[PDB]
Subunit: 30 residues, 2 copies
């Protein structure tokens, strides 16, 4: 449970990080 | 456990979804 509780917070951190950065570029890019 | 373990799968699963989506876009819109 503990290994999985840290994974999802690391992964949740980046999930949006990725949905934010991928987006930010798109608007940014064209 | 399953909240973490449906969404660990899902979140990792998105943590390459966008993670290799971003990449390509780097070398696409780039």
């Amino acid at each position: 449970l503990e290994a999985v509780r840290r994974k999802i917070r690391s992964l949740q951190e980046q999930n949006y990080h990725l949905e934010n950065e991928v987006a930010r570029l798109k608007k940014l890019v064209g």
